[model samples]
Target: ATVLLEVPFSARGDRIPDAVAELRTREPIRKVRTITGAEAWLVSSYALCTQVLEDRRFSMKETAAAGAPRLNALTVPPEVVNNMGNIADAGLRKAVMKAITPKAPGLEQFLRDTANSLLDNLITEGAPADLRNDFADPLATALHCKVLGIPQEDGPKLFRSLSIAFMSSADPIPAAKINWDRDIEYMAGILENPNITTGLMGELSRLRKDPAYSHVSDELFATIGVTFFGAGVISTGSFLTTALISLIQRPQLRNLLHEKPELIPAGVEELLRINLSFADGLPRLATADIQVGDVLVRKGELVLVLLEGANFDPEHFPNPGSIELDRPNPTSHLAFGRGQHFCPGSALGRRHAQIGIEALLKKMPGVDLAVPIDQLVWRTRFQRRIPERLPVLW
Candidate 1:
């Protein structure tokens, strides 16, 4: 059959993509060819997506196998993929976890100060400021550097290169390869430094001295570095940008937050639940034949769990379109994902949003969109739905 919906159904305006909403009614789990011409099963319902994610039979490890249905032509080697999660090599996974997990001291304080500093400049620059570029982008880069123990001075350049490498995944194979190699080598040099081993890098450095992790290479560290940067900065930055857009559009909600400062955490959770940051869903491969919803996915079949569809699923969320600040169980959303593959940076991402939003409200209470909301452009080149530039004024 022809592709039911393009892999990433880009948002036409400020609303959620209609394909996901439409799929919920059609087939919660059904076979559909991918834009890449790969045949796969698309799971769109909240219940089905959760079942596929939590079941161990559905494995990410198989996605890297030869002849697998891949979203992109660019292939990640097994060695790199093995270091990602609960797959194999516990020692190396532990070391990778140590380097990227957000257990560092004073992480919130660092993000708070970084957000304050960025806002100070935006406030001074007066109105008509591009919030995504001026505030969200730099704040995200600095936070990533702090968490990775990279020098603050080098963050902007590294952030740019890493972003190019990530965005280039959709580019031609040759172009993507060049940027990937260049970016990995650049990040590898950063991790190779002895002086910079203070924070998360310090943990990795300590592991290097231990006999248990002698097999860990700088290449692996670089892979972990790129993974963390891609995971930490790109996704987290898009999330922050989307949250800001929502807040800018709703003045009453801002007032509610200002009056009841205690609700900031709850408000953040609600935003996470409703945020359309991920333009697409997570991909997996069936290790064994499994029944998801009403369909039986065969062994070796590729399956995609539509996160945005799941979060907006009416069964789990009533009036899923409207934002409920006091959403009793906002954590139920699969934005950070579920099961063993759940995002490790979730706590850090939430803390960053909380501090960033709190600081913005307190420092720039008068801020709102400088132009009409529809006038702003949304990025379409990538999977994630993000504003190209959020022009704002006080």
Candidate 2:
């Protein structure tokens, strides 16, 4: 009879874990039973989650269908949900993936410079720096803009504005509609650039050329265009910011890396899985009537994949709760997710985080929180959970 409310703070640190354990051992596909008496399905398990994720039968496209599955809110249309699957298309997916890949080799160097440069400015700027605003936000925005080939000068302003348009499904329909409009308008101008660098614009140009890719609608191009700016920037920013907080709490974790630099790549995966910055994993709707663990996902019911639960499963990884920095097999996480809709930016995300961490350690080895842990606030309201302002000093 527990009711999941839309309260601003209830989904805090390890709260979902408590909810997940109860569901996994007791009822894997349980009802949300909202405070308002709304019932939503909660799916908890690694295998069930991957099944739902990869099973097009349980589709994001049908999420907004009348009488279909929905989360707390339904701001976007069913087409956008459908768009998630189309993203796996060979032509479309390849173009989008290629645009982001070329930037990978340079990302480590760029992220390193970005971190050290930001840290220097923050230190000179003063001690009470808001890591979210000063470091994390800018680092994410900068790298994304660079990856997508947007001019460095205009990146932050455009990135921030577009992020406002990219509202979470948690928001009401009207607010989401308004944000969607704002998002469309913001990209209308940005995507029109013919000379825009070799990232998003370049891909858009390619789409306009090839005969085989001729089927890719302009709307599809625009959608991926906005996606490059929208998804790549904010989520990565929140993730890296949250990772920073984890590092602060577990400084020895970072110190361990200094001693064993070879573990940076594995450490990055551990950080993402253990931190679980995304409290509620991607919102997905069941494509058909499917049985996931104990609960049945009636076709079209909305469900949240508890990545935190899956990552912490005792069935897969040994002593799952504890952090083994060099856990021999760290590549097995759904931190970036699985299936056709798997995050294309995953490789880039890891690269950014790896170099970002390395830079922080080299720059501020003796860093400690400037403010007390309890006093520090986190951005809990969004899909991404992160410290609002992680103040630190060496």
Candidate 3:
């Protein structure tokens, strides 16, 4: 009998695994076991993936149900899984979406300045700069602080909590809980701070005081702060960092954008399409009986939507490994995801990468890996796969 293939394929985040293309053509909706030893339908093909996500019956909320199969373990309390929905239910969704949009007045300029300023420091520091730490993450950190209305100085402390805070595990992590609680407390304090009077926190603070939301728990307000910052920083930082590696590896694409910076936005879209940053599949629990491909996914069953599987489908994106700037379906990829639970911070993430790339190309167009590609270490068992240290030279 053949072995039931286990996932995440591999943790080396620099490239999409070849098995993804193979699996898409073969058993696109095959079953696999998770780190928690839970069986899950690993839906990979583009059509089947869209089917799962588009159907409201496949719910992200039920993924947290006790005794349900898990894609990975929770880094925060189980209820926190519906963090975005919780925000919408509070009737504050519009303000949040609007506030966090980088298009908001002054935000885009802030992104441009921060990206350039970060590059200036790296230039002073000289070659072999750790792009992940010195560049991508700092840019995300600075962006998140401005978005959350928290002091940039306070960011590093909350950011310190996230490495453990974003861990994908099969079991409870004691360290994650400790730091999450600490960061939650910090966020709650920000809600009351007199100076915290703009961005998401400021609006949330005002709404919290209004009669309409007087009953909203302090826990949730703080959670909005912590999770907004937590999800924003990790995904944005990890994505930009990984995208940089992808762009650098593609000498042609790098120079293409370097020579024609106007196409940076298009370049960023393709970069997002090919990015293998999400190490684990996006988990959903089938809310009701449904036929997905050959298998009938039963109610309450856990499903792991493999982003790369659909993203790399040869039919959907021919020569999926190659980053083509003119691809007709560039932004159709699920880099940010799809359906109801699609990432709310998607725009913010895109702009973060876009601005960061534009600045890097202008500042260090000759950027290349300092060591051989294999020398870079990849982080595993986390929501996003990124290098421990991305050493690069211009």
Which candidate, 1 or 3, has the higher lDDT? 3
What's each prediction's TM-score? 0.92, 0.88, 0.98
Clashing pairs in 2: 57-287, 58-286, 58-287, 59-287, 69-300
Residues 1-394, candidate 2: write the lDDT tens digits.
8546332224454223455566566765566643223456665667777777888776656656776444545545546656655666635766677767635566667777888999888778877677778887788888877777667887766566543444344446465566566666655555577676466666666556679777766666656656666677777777787777777778788788767777887777887777667755566776668887766777656677768767776666677777776676677877888886778788888877887778777767777788887776655445666666788877
Model 1 is weakest, by summed lDDT over 10 consecutive residues, at: 163-172
Per-candidate RMSD, Å: 2.4, 2.9, 1.1
Give model 1 RMSD, 1 decimal.
2.4
Cα lDDT over the full model 3: 0.89
Q: Candidate 3's residue-wise lDDT over 1-394, tens digit each? A: 9866787789988877778877888899999988888889999988888888898899988888988878888888887999888888888788888888888788989999999998899899899799999999999999999998888899888888888888888888999988988988888888889898999999898988999999889999999899889899999999999999999998998999999988989999988888889888888998889999899999989888899888888889998888888988888998888989888888899899999999999999899999999998988888789999999999
Using TM-score, rank the candidates from best to worst. 3, 1, 2
Assess the local accuracy of residue 192 in candidate 2 as a C-alpha lDDT between 0 and 100: 70
Stretches > 4 Å off in candidate 2: 1-9, 13-19, 34-37, 74-77, 87-90, 102-105, 162-179, 209-215
